[PDB]
Design a protein around this ligand. Structure first.
Ligand SMILES: CC1=C(CCOP(=O)(O)OP(=O)(O)O)SCN1Cc1cnc(C)nc1N
Ligand SMILES: Cc1ncc(C[n+]2csc(CCOP(=O)(O)OP(=O)(O)O)c2C)c(N)n1
Ligand SMILES: [Ca+2]
Ligand SMILES: [Mg+2]
Ligand SMILES: [Mg+2]
Lengths: 453, 422, 302, 121, 182
């Protein structure tokens, strides 16, 4: 034991610096999102690799004293290496992978370690589960209805990533708690209508009206497609006692070209309200994995993020990593392990989360919203998911990616498995789950008659 | 200088068609929809007819025969944005297994490369341009997903491809394929902006090349910065790519490829335009009942590309065959003065109109009009039939786009809209 | 001996690549001898590595050119052709077609052969004058030791050297007749004695310093001209013996490899045996590699 | 950078009509790096979207024989993206022709030669 | 050192700063040819419009002093626009590697020169670094040299970037960085 504790020190290094390379982020089961199937010699998945550190099977029960760069112990100041490895594997090698060790500020690292390593922190109330269930039901049934009424159109729906809506709602609610009153958003094609209907409560009747073939524009202008239009709406938050204004900026089809426009608008709003550190105005941006890692303007925007007279004091980026471009394998789309590696040039932490477990998505979104208020820096949230249909509702995915979609056809939607988990725990009962699906279907149908009128 | 004919003997064409339609591996399993496409390809090949996808095989294979490397690069080019070529086939059961039917055409053949690039236009185009300036014995093609996303690479186009030969001696023959056409799609899916390329041309409208010059073209092409073309038939698309290589020199080529003509039933041509002794056609004359009695024709309409198949349908619906003569223009780059002068002479008494798909301030009008006015001694005012000027490339409302097309076809065949003025 | 591990790892890909590459070799031989017969050229050579696939394309392009313009191309009877990166005629009379030039540029070169031939006579007369000046001294253009020099540049160097040196000061003696050659280096630093046995002497040099340098090291140069040939002969016999021992199709060297290095290379192969070298192409180089068309690169340092 | 800064300024200019936002280019020839922003946001933005933008772009221009990339800001590219119709003569005899004409147009281009006009614009 | 390790062909791209010095010594261009450009009465034989001296390319092959092996050099003509000739150099390197039958680019090498202000503010740097590793685009290694003189045109380096060093894009592809006091 003269210098065996040293190994344990190095042991912790591995996890905090490499655990995310062995986390279970993919929902399908095949396809490693990090493009690496290899397991690092640092991480101990099998007991044999204890020999890498000069340890054998007899060392597991010995009791070790933890340092101040770990919060796994909680009340305890010492632990068996058995329990140490167990806690560390839960902390970084599961449904959440944290990439944060490149920053050189100790107070920012201690904050992250406390948020993610302490035991039992991620605990959700039954009411929070109920709200999440309702939001998931709404997000799923809206796309179901769109399929039933307009089969031929190119909806660009969010099947495969239905946890985006509750994530955005959680981010906005936590920000409203922290004093924000005005939010500006920019977003690509994928999932625009669902957000226009369930986050910025645009009147559903106009959403349906846009689909009508017999539509004229009485304005004297060329006009734009349904996925390029701006919506401004102020609504009282349910959870908070305060109101919030939500703005969505109209963008062209060129990808990621509306990021600096959103930054400029945020800066102007902060300036006019007499805000010196952007505490009451916030920005949120949505990206796709293929565009976020191949366009040059992302680099320039990230560099603009911090210069004085251009800084807006923090942005929350959300990347929808569905592991495919148009028909392009992610292996031939980038030269880095993850699409979110430009964020490493400005020292912004990254949280990857498996979007098949909603109760970790909610916690990650909450933590990111708190970070932006505490430190006024950028933060990136990566949602690993899949794409159920083709790029369009008329693309044929099988011609180019035969094996991946075969697994997709044999996997359950997230709403189902969440419903059975809740029913098993006793939080809810099947009579209650059927009632909500029926209620959302009455609201949708009445609106369709109004659109026909 | 002269250019050899680009035609080929028939057995080469049949062998190429049979190879592309067939799958080299019996073990390989092909998607049922893809199998139907391969069967339809055979349907056409046995009948001695080519669609747009087969002409590209019959150009690439014929070039690969005589040791010419071919590199096709772009964004989702292995299958096609509109899913029409399928240059790469995937096994449905075994993972990572792939066949390229064009690598099995002949035993001694040059290398072929098809690669899907990252999502970028400004780095990939520069990479391809650098690749194209290392040897004149290669054909490097860059494919754009839509013609509207090329402006992200404007710098490379403005600084390297446009003045490259004037600023520095090096010659480069890169080919750019840009889909183009207004089909009720979103504004950013309509018009590849040909009017921007056509104004970078160093040609002078007032200056007229001497009619008495050899070929006139091997000299119009030589005294030019780059070649632009808008092909409407697969035979011309076959001939252009071969002329690009068989010429004594190299110059950049800009082709405006179609989108909805990839499946249009009457946009296909026979083997008789590919047999030896056939040439690329810069202007496609008017062949039909009108050419038999020229004096009877009262109006001559000049068009380009996708519009043609819309005008022809309208003319029959109105019983005006033999009253209107429609002529296509295929090059536009070093404008073809000599051929177009003959067409005006062919119909002594017929007003000249330019019919167009796009808006008045875009498209090919205002480049073509001075040149057409130059060929004649201002004998007849060149009129215009098309869409009105607008700020955006195309409208986002589907209902207005149809009405606009209807009024376009209304003014084209009225015979009195400008006749009363003149 | 890491070459054993490298061979065991990479031999199979090499044999597969050779098996794929045979048809292109057959096609290259057919194209080369057909073109050589048609234009009555003495030879066709290449200056860079380049693989069987690019060489075939170059031969195809030259064949197309001969198909289009035959009368002008016919002016090259008895002239060997080398493929380079720049056009023009070389210092010892080679048409140097360049890989980056279009047919319009080659046709212009084939229409100017008589004038280049005329210039060659003037250059030869200059050679004779310089030879008689310092006593019989051959002025040679050793390629792969000088930059690629077009005929005009070499003529200009010879002219400036002769003019600027004869006018001011001179020393004469008919000795040095049998041996001693001059590279006529293009003014790098100063006169020097190369290891082979020749002299790379800068132009516009000081005649006094030139004389003092030349007069003193004749015997060492004469000794070097025989060392070089006898090492070359021992190389011929060693390279024959190695092919006999290991049954190679051909064994060859990079131009940059010194003959002594090939001495040591063949000597330290001949005492060892390796399995996978049978029936393969091997070349001596500076690195561990396998070429795309199936050749193996073994550095002369194990 | 020209492609991020111009976008930032354009976004700043669409938050209030009581500000004057100017973007300066070092030479008029480096603007094409931002062509996307000019082609999709500034030029057809009010035709496609209700929002109206009042940004000003200053581009140095003039051939002093300083070389190809230090001469001509390419005015012919801006002048062709205008929505004006060439083959029609408007009714010259109407009050406020100058403002009516200015009310329906995608943007304005000017080439001032005196400082007084530059003050007035 | 590269010539020692078996390289025979080098392709270079370089910005405005220091171009003439490199042509005179590194590319070994004739001094008389350089001095001739500065003459005003100079006419151009070509029908080409022509370009300024700092935008012209140069190709040259010569025996290395350290290594008896011949080495071939090439400098690519670029416009005044900064960083826009990086993909062109990459493409030319890839083509030369392909034609010489080189499977891992061992005999062809690329070198690029940058300035600190342009290397940290242009988008095409990001795209080129991403292209560096994709199969069918990789050239198997590049040496980037950044001239960090701590100033742009008249712009303080504090208002030019949001990162400690100009060379932090290199961290997205895991390339080591060596800063040295010149
Ligand atoms: C290839 C291409 C796409 C892939 C999206 O890939 P992604 O970011 O991963 O999004 P996804 O989750 O798959 O919807 S869409 C549109 N497009 C064409 C496209 C390409 N380049 C530019 C600048 N704008 C575009 N509009
Ligand atoms: C695309 C482009 N925009 C603007 C300029 C104008 N310009 C010339 S030098 C320079 C400064 C660039 O800074 P840096 O690279 O650090 O240069 P250095 O210290 O070597 O002078 C600028 C902006 C240019 N050359 N290229
Ligand atoms: Ca992994
Ligand atoms: Mg995606
Ligand atoms: Mg600097």
């Amino acid at each position: 034991l003269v210098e065996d504790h040293l190994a344990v020190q190095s042991l912790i290094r591995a996890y905090q610096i490499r655990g995310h390379h062995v986390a279970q982020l993919d929902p399908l089961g095949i396809l490693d999102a990090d493009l690496d199937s290899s397991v690092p010699a640092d991480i101990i998945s099998s007991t044999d690799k204890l020999g890498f550190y000069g340890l054998d099977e007899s060392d597991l029960d010995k009791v070790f004293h933890l340092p101040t760069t770990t919060f796994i112990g909680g009340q305890e100041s010492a632990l068996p290496l058995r329990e140490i490895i167990r806690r560390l594997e839960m902390a970084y090698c599961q449904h959440i992978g944290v990439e944060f060790m490149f920053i050189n500020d100790l107070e920012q690292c201690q904050w992250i370690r406390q948020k993610f390593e302490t035991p039992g922190i991620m605990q959700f109330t039954n009411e929070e589960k109920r709200t999440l269930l309702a939001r998931l039901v709404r997000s799923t049934r809206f796309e179901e209805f769109l399929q039933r009424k307009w089969s031929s159109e190119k909806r660009f729906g969010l099947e495969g990533c239905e946890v985006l809506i509750p994530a955005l709602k959680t981010i906005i609610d936590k920000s409203s708690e922290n004093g924000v009153d005005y939010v500006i958003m920019g977003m690509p094609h994928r999932g625009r209508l669902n957000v226009l209907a369930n986050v910025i409560r645009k009147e559903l009747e106009q959403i349906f009206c846009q689909f009508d073939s017999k539509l004229e524009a009485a304005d004297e202008g060329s006009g734009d497609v349904k996925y390029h239009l701006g919506m401004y709406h102020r609504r009282i938050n349910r959870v908070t006692d305060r109101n919030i204004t939500l703005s969505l900026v109209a963008n062209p089809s060129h990808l990621e070209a509306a990021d600096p426009v959103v930054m400029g608008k945020t800066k102007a709003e902060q300036f006019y309200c007499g805000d010196t550190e952007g505490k009451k105005v916030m920005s949120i941006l949505l990206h796709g994995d293929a565009a976020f890692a191949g366009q040059g303007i992302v680099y320039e925007t990230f560099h603009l993020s911090d210069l004085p007279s251009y800084t807006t004091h923090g942005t929350v980026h959300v990347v929808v990593n569905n592991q495919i471009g148009f028909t392009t394998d992610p292996r031939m789309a980038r030269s880095s392990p993850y699409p979110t590696d430009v964020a490493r040039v400005v020292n912004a932490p990254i949280f990857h989360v498996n979007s098949d477990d909603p109760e970790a998505v909610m916690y990650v979104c909450k933590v990111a919203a708190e970070w932006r208020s505490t430190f006024h820096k950028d933060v990136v949230v990566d949602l690993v998911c899949y794409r159920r249909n083709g790029h369009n509702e008329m693309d044929e995915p099988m011609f180019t990616q035969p094996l991946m979609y075969k697994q997709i056809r044999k996997q359950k939607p997230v709403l189902q498995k969440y419903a059975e988990l809740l029913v098993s725990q006793g939080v809810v009962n099947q009579p209650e789950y059927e009632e909500e699906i029926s209620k959302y279907d009455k609201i949708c149908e009445e609106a369709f008659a109004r659109s026909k009128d | 200088m002269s250019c050899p004919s680009t035609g080929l003997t028939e057995d080469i064409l049949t062998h190429i068609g049979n190879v592309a339609s067939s799958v080299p591996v019996e073990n390989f399993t092909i998607h049922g929809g893809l199998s139907r496409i391969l069967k339809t390809r055979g349907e056409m090949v046995k009948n001695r007819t080519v669609d747009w996808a087969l002409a590209e095989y019959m150009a690439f294979g014929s070039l690969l025969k005589e040791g010419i490397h071919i590199r096709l690069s772009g964004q989702d080019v292995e299958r096609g944005t509109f899913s029409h070529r399928h240059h790469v086939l995937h096994d449905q059961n075994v993972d990572k297994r792939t066949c390229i039917p064009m690598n099995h055409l002949w035993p001694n053949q040059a290398p072929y490369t098809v690669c899907n690039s990252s999502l970028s236009e400004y780095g990939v185009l520069g990479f391809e341009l650098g690749f194209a300036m290392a040897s004149p014995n290669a054909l490097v093609l860059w494919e754009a997903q839509f013609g509207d996303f090329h402006n992200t690479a404007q710098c490379i186009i403005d600084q390297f491809i446009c003045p490259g030969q004037a600023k520095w001696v090096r010659q480069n023959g890169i080919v750019l394929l840009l889909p183009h056409g207004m089909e009720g799609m979103g504004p950013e899916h309509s018009s590849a902006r040909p009017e921007r390329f056509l104004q970078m041309c160093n040609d002078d409208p007032d200056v007229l090349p001497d009619l008495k010059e050899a070929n006139f073209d091997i000299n119009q092409l030589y005294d030019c910065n780059w070649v632009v073309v808008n092909c409407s038939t697969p035979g011309n698309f076959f001939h252009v790519l071969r002329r690009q290589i068989l010429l004594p020199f190299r110059k950049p080529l800009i082709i405006f490829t179609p989108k909805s003509l990839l499946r249009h039933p009457e946009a296909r041509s026979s083997f008789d335009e590919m047999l030896p002794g056939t040439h690329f056609q810069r202007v496609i004359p008017e062949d039909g009942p009108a050419a038999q009695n020229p004096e009877n024709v009262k109006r001559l309409l000049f068009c380009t590309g996708k519009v043609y198949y819309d005008l022809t349908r309208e003319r029959k619906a109105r019983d005006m065959v033999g009253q209107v003569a429609i002529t296509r223009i295929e090059q536009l780059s070093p404008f073809p003065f000599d051929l177009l002068l003959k067409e005006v002479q062919k119909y002594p008494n017929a007003e000249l109109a330019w019919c167009q798909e796009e808006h008045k301030n875009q498209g090919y009008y205002d480049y073509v009009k001075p040149r057409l006015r130059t060929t004649i001694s201002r004998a007849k005012p060149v009129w215009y039939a098309g869409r009105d000027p607008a700020a955006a490339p195309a409208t986002g409302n589907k209902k207005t786009h149809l009405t606009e097309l209807q009024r376009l076809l209304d003014t084209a065949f009225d015979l009195d809209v400008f006749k009363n003025f003149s | 001996t890491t070459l054993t591990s490298w061979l065991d790892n990479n031999g199979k890909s090499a044999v597969k690549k050779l098996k794929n590459s045979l048809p292109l070799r057959k096609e290259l031989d057919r194209l080369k001898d057909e073109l050589s017969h048609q234009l009555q050229l003495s030879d066709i050579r290449w200056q860079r590595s380049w693989g069987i696939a690019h060489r075939c394309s170059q031969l195809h392009s030259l064949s197309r050119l001969a198909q289009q313009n035959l009368e002008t191309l016919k002016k090259a009877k008895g002239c060997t052709i080398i493929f380079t990166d720049r056009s023009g005629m070389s210092a010892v009379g080679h048409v140097m077609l360049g890989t980056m030039d279009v047919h319009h540029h080659w046709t212009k070169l084939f229409e100017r052969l008589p004038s280049y031939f005329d210039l060659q006579r003037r250059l030869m007369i200059l050679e004779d004058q310089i030879s008689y000046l310092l006593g019989g001294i051959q002025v040679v253009y050793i390629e792969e030791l000088q930059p690629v020099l077009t005929l005009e540049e070499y003529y200009s160097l010879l002219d400036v050297f002769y003019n600027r040196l004869l006018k001011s000061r001179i020393l004469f003696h008919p000795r040095s007749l049998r041996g001693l050659q001059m590279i006529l280096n293009s003014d790098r630093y100063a006169p020097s004695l190369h290891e082979l046995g020749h002299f790379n002497i800068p132009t516009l040099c000081d005649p006094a310093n030139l004389q003092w340098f030349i007069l003193t090291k004749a015997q060492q140069a004469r000794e070097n001209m025989k060392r070089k040939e006898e090492l070359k002969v021992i190389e011929n016999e060693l390279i024959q013996a190695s092919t006999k021992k290991f049954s190679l199709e051909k064994l060859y060297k990079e131009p940059s490899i010194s003959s002594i290095q090939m001495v040591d290379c063949c000597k330290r192969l001949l005492e060892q045996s390796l399995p996978y070298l049978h029936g393969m192409h091997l070349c001596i180089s500076h690195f561990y590699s396998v070429m795309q068309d199936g050749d193996l690169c073994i550095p002369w340092n194990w």
